[PDB]
Amino acid sequence: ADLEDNMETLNDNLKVIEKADNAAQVKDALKKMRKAALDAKKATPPKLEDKSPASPEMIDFRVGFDELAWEIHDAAHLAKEGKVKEAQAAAEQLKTTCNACHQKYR
Amino acid sequence: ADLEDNMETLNDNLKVIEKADNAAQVKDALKKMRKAALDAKKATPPKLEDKSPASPEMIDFRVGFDELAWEIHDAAHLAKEGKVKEAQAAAEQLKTTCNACHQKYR
Amino acid sequence: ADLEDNMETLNDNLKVIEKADNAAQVKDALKKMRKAALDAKKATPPKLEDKSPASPEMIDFRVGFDELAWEIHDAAHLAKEGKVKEAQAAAEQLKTTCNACHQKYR
Numbered sequence A, B, C: 001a002d003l004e005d006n007m008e009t010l011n012d013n014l015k016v017i018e019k020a021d022n023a024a025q026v027k028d029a030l031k032k033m034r035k036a037a038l039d040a041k042k043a044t045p046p047k048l049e050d051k052s053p054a055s056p057e058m059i060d061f062r063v064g065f066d067e068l069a070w071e072i073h074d075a076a077h078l079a080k081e082g083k084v085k086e087a088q089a090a091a092e093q094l095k096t097t098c099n100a101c102h103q104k105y106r
């Protein structure tokens, strides 16, 4: 998928998680987020398209999705132990990782 | 190890997992797969050797091993909870990630 | 943070883990290690600054931090199951991954 579609998937599933009623719904949404994070890692964002493909900025962009995938994995750990409310709160905390990348490159 | 040896390790351990008799055998095989996936990420495949080192294709190649490592990690989660048959079925499902990369670059 | 500060964070938390008295202290230290490993992945080490940004050596450097992050994650798994002594021993085993990168690039 392209970068914009992966971002919608990320945004839509944050809300799905917030409103989820059970562990399986949070787990499923978090799995879609991880898939979208890894897929976004393949793109060149518009504001970096003039940079070289392995410029420090493009490396920082790609590693941002590794950081997001690891944070998603911690939240998924909580959902798999059945700690649904703690997983929902960890998911909402993802926004600081979202924001950090946005402030630099979006 | 070189790319071809990492692929054999991946292929051989898929079969080891299929025939495994207990959780520890699946766990051990999945750990060897993850190690091989990360090691393969360092290579340039023959059909991409004319591309630039951070070309979209080489990025897509390397991220494919992140996707495989994450899918392996989900299967390993199942083996560590003792759900041996579910882990064996998740391992067989890895083939769709194997195939997707192969269809593009092998 | 810069590469040198991320390495200190890695070194300091290995010792924190060795002397830890409970699971939460090991968990917290391992989380700081993962964060530092991913952050170090954004740097160019001095001995590679003449290489091209996606040279095989820079790829090998960056993938070394993926390998370290995955090994840290296995240790964290043990700390979250309450197997504190096994997690402490896994952490000390990280040194062979530290050493392998150092022998090549530091």
Ligand code: HEC
Residues within 6 Å of the ligand: A003, A004, A007, A008, A010, A011, A014, A045, A046, A060, A061, A062, A063, A064, A065, A068, A094, A095, A097, A098, A099, A101, A102, A105, A106
């Ligand atoms: C960098 C490593 C990023 C991370 C982590 C996240 N996002 Fe992102 N996002 C990024 C860029 C460079 C862009 C611009 C894309 C473009 O083509 O202009 C975006 C965009 C979005 C959007 C807007 C999508 C649209 O309709 O055009 C949304 C809604 C969005 N991003 C959400 C989002 C969330 C919820 C994240 C964390 C879970 C997140 N992003 C991470 C770069 C990066």
Ligand code: HEC
Residues within 6 Å of the ligand: B003, B004, B007, B008, B010, B011, B014, B045, B046, B060, B061, B062, B063, B064, B065, B068, B094, B095, B097, B098, B099, B101, B102, B105, B106
């Ligand atoms: C890209 C991201 C890949 C993923 C994921 C997997 N493989 Fe692969 N494989 C890839 C390439 C580019 C090649 C060609 C290597 C070459 O030098 O020609 C291969 C090759 C194989 C082989 C053949 C090895 C040989 O004897 O020459 C096998 C048996 C193989 N791959 C298996 C395999 C499995 C089981 C995977 C998932 C678990 C898998 N590969 C993933 C690229 C990629």
Ligand code: HEC
Residues within 6 Å of the ligand: C003, C004, C007, C008, C010, C011, C014, C045, C046, C060, C061, C062, C063, C064, C065, C068, C094, C095, C097, C098, C099, C101, C102, C105, C106
């Ligand atoms: C490559 C993939 C590395 C891994 C994994 C680890 N380290 Fe490292 N380290 C690396 C380099 C290239 C350098 C040189 C940095 C420089 O600017 O010269 C280092 C350095 C250190 C240091 C010295 C820091 C200082 O005071 O200058 C320490 C104490 C250190 N590294 C520790 C360390 C530990 C404990 C690791 C595993 C947990 C580890 N490093 C991994 C490259 C890489």
Ligand SMILES: [Ca+2]
Residues within 6 Å of the ligand: A004
């Ligand atoms: Ca839009």
Ligand SMILES: [Ca+2]
Residues within 6 Å of the ligand: A004
């Ligand atoms: Ca649009």
Ligand SMILES: [Ca+2]
Residues within 6 Å of the ligand: A019, A020, A021
């Ligand atoms: Ca609800």
Ligand SMILES: [Ca+2]
Residues within 6 Å of the ligand: A018, A019, A020
């Ligand atoms: Ca609700």
Ligand SMILES: [Ca+2]
Residues within 6 Å of the ligand: B004
């Ligand atoms: Ca062959």
Ligand SMILES: [Ca+2]
Residues within 6 Å of the ligand: B004
């Ligand atoms: Ca051959």
Ligand SMILES: [Ca+2]
Residues within 6 Å of the ligand: B019, B020, B021
């Ligand atoms: Ca058998």
Ligand SMILES: [Ca+2]
Residues within 6 Å of the ligand: B018, B019, B020
């Ligand atoms: Ca059998």
Ligand SMILES: [Ca+2]
Residues within 6 Å of the ligand: C004
């Ligand atoms: Ca120093």
Ligand SMILES: [Ca+2]
Residues within 6 Å of the ligand: C004
């Ligand atoms: Ca110094």
Ligand SMILES: [Ca+2]
Residues within 6 Å of the ligand: C019, C020, C021
């Ligand atoms: Ca102590």
Ligand SMILES: [Ca+2]
Residues within 6 Å of the ligand: C018, C019, C020
């Ligand atoms: Ca002690």
Ligand SMILES: [Cl-]
Residues within 6 Å of the ligand: A030, A031, A034, A072, A073, A076
């Ligand atoms: Cl996950």
